Amino acid sequence: EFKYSEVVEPSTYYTEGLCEGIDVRKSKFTTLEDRGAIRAHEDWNKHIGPCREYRGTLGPRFSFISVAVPECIPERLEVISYANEFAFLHDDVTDGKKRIQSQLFLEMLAIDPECAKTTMKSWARTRFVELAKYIPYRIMDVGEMFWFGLVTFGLGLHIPDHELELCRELMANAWIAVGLQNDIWSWPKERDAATLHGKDHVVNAIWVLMQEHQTDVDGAMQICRKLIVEYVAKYLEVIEATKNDESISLDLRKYLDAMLYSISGNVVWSLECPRYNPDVSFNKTQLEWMRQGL
Ligand SMILES: NCCCCCC(O)(P(=O)(O)O)P(=O)(O)O
Ligand SMILES: [Cl-]
Ligand SMILES: [Mn+2]
Ligand SMILES: [Mn+2]
Ligand SMILES: [Mn+2]
Ligand SMILES: [Mn+2]
Numbered sequence: 001e002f003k004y005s006e007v008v009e010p011s012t013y014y015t016e017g018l019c020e021g022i023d024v025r026k027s028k029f030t031t032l033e034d035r036g037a038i039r040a041h042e043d044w045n046k047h048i049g050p051c052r053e054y055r056g057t058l059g060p061r062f063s064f065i066s067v068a069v070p071e072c073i074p075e076r077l078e079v080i081s082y083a084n085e086f087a088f089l090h091d092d093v094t095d096g097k098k099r100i101q102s103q104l105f106l107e108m109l110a111i112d113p114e115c116a117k118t119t120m121k122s123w124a125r126t127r128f129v130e131l132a133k134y135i136p137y138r139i140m141d142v143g144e145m146f147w148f149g150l151v152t153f154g155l156g157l158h159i160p161d162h163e164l165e166l167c168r169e170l171m172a173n174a175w176i177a178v179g180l181q182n183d184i185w186s187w188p189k190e191r192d193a194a195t196l197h198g199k200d201h202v203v204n205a206i207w208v209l210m211q212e213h214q215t216d217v218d219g220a221m222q223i224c225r226k227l228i229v230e231y232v233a234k235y236l237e238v239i240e241a242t243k244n245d246e247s248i249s250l251d252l253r254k255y256l257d258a259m260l261y262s263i264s265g266n267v268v269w270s271l272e273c274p275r276y277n278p279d280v281s282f283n284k285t286q287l288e289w290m291r292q293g294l
Pocket of ligand 6 (some may be wrong): 182183186187190
């Protein structure tokens with residue numbers, strides 16, 4: 001079932017109980033993520049704006065995709081990472097000579113034509129105060145469709161265009177969980193941010209909660225955390241049920257199972273990622289490429 005990654009040993013990383021039930025697997029080719037990402041840095045630096053030693057998908061120990069998609073087909077690892085960083089870019093901008101990223105697009109056809117077209121096609125595209133309302137919004141402000149299109153490719157999945165409607169209704173709890181996670185850890189980031197624009201609000205669950213619940217910062221977190229834990233289960237439920245219906249795509253069922261590790265992945269990464277954790281430094285290896293190599 002798994003041939004491109006190893007389980008990470010639990011006594012070596014912190015989970016904060018925020019993914020009870022999921023192994024942690026590392027892609028066993030993580031340095032491909034390194035190189036795919038950094039090229040994107042260079043390309044960005046090259047073609048649209050300054051970009052050196054950027055805090056995105058890379059972590060000194062846990063880099064995102066290496067740990068969020070650890071069974072990704074090795075040959076495809078770089079370009080995916082290349083994508084994700086660009087994604088991680090195009091976000092910072094949200095919170096020219098850039099159409100030239102078809103070289104990326106082109107890169108994919110050379111590998112998997114159909115998977116590419118989907119994914120590409122798949123890539124067709126505030127101030128909330130009650131959680132019930134936010135959840136719809138953020139579940140895409142985090143990038144459901146992107147990630148979808150992303151993983152399918154790297155796993156070379158083909159799902160028939162009809163389950164498309166279905167699939168998303170399965171991974172609600174999932175996408176829900178990770179949204180909150182980001183909002184927990186991207187919180188100070190995204191918090192200091194709203195402080196600058198002069199915003200009265202922060203488009204972040206923590207802020208919503210504080211409003212919806214008359215509570216302070218601390219109060220918002222505990223709840224959110226209490227919640228994440230519960231959407232975890234809610235999704236885990238699904239697995240067991242869905243484990244054996246053949247009207248379900250082999251691929252979908254794969255894709256579902258694969259989502260587990262994005263969750264576990266998100267945790268450890270976000271607990272480390274220089275992106276959310278400035279104090280965090282990279283690898284010798286990681287840097288040696290950023291400063292000099294690649
Ligand atoms: N698929 C996992 C990517 C998590 C990124 C979350 C964010 O990009 P970040 O909090 O990193 O800016 P968003 O701004 O959309 O909350
Ligand atoms: Cl822990
Ligand atoms: Mn533990
Ligand atoms: Mn952001
Ligand atoms: Mn964003
Ligand atoms: Mn965020």
